[PDB]
Design a binder for this molecule. Sequence first.
Ligand SMILES: Cc1cnc(Oc2ccc3nc(COc4cccc(C(=O)O)c4)n(C)c3c2)c(C)c1
Ligand SMILES: [Cl-]
Ligand SMILES: [Cl-]
Lengths: 10, 260
Amino acid sequence: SLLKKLLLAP
Amino acid sequence: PESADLRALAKHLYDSYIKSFPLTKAKARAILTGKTTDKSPFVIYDMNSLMMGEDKISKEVAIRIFQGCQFRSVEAVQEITEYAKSIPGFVNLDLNDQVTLLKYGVHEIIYTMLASLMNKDGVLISEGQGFMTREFLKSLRKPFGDFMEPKFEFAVKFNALELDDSDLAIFIAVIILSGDRPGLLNVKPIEDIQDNLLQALELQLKLNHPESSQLFAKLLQKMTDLRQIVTEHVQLLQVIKKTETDMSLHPLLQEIYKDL
Ligand SMILES: Cc1cnc(Oc2ccc3nc(COc4cccc(C(=O)O)c4)n(C)c3c2)c(C)c1
Ligand SMILES: [Cl-]
Ligand SMILES: [Cl-]
């Protein structure tokens, strides 16, 4: 998901 | 002391809040009051001034405004996500639970922070570059005329509590760490973090607002109020996406609104 991707970007 | 640790947590959250949110309430109230040193915001109070501002800051105005709010929401979701990642213990939670906490909590935070940019007469837009009047927003054609009014009503009441950025940083953290969101896989660790945040919030309010009777209880109630604000918003969105056509929804919002 997009939220997951935002959460993973350091 | 356990209290000393609660103050360090409060400060950590404030510092993170400053790093994550470019426009703070402190900066925003300075603009709304005029104390600001920067250039005054461009005021949008009617159709003509909106046209002029589209140059300073196909679709009908009401839709353009509505979608403008949606784009700002997308920007806010990203800022809030960065802030959530700074809350101690958050990044170590099950990744799917982090998604769930954001999915069900971002709008409550968006409306909390929007209040910081509002007064009874209007709202700051594009980080203080413009000021759109409440009068103009409710002048838009239905159903867009009542899109923001409930948010303005909430903000006037919320702002009457006179919270500052330090109070807000903890208030927002508590909301994000809600162990009752639908579908959470591991509630206990979220609740333990929230319980600590709640202790920090209580101490913050007793120290920062010594004369404000029952401020903590009032904030717990604002948390409930915010969920009702989101419920109504979601309800209005479905009325719009039922009578309006050709409208495009940002994928990040489509994801958040799904099953919600
Ligand atoms: C020049 C110009 C200025 N603003 C324009 O349109 C906009 C563009 C961005 C905006 N940001 C806000 C702030 O209000 C918000 C922000 C976020 C969420 C919500 C909400 O209720 O969900 C409301 N308003 C009113 C905007 C109106 C246009 C189309 C042109
Ligand atoms: Cl106000
Ligand atoms: Cl919920």
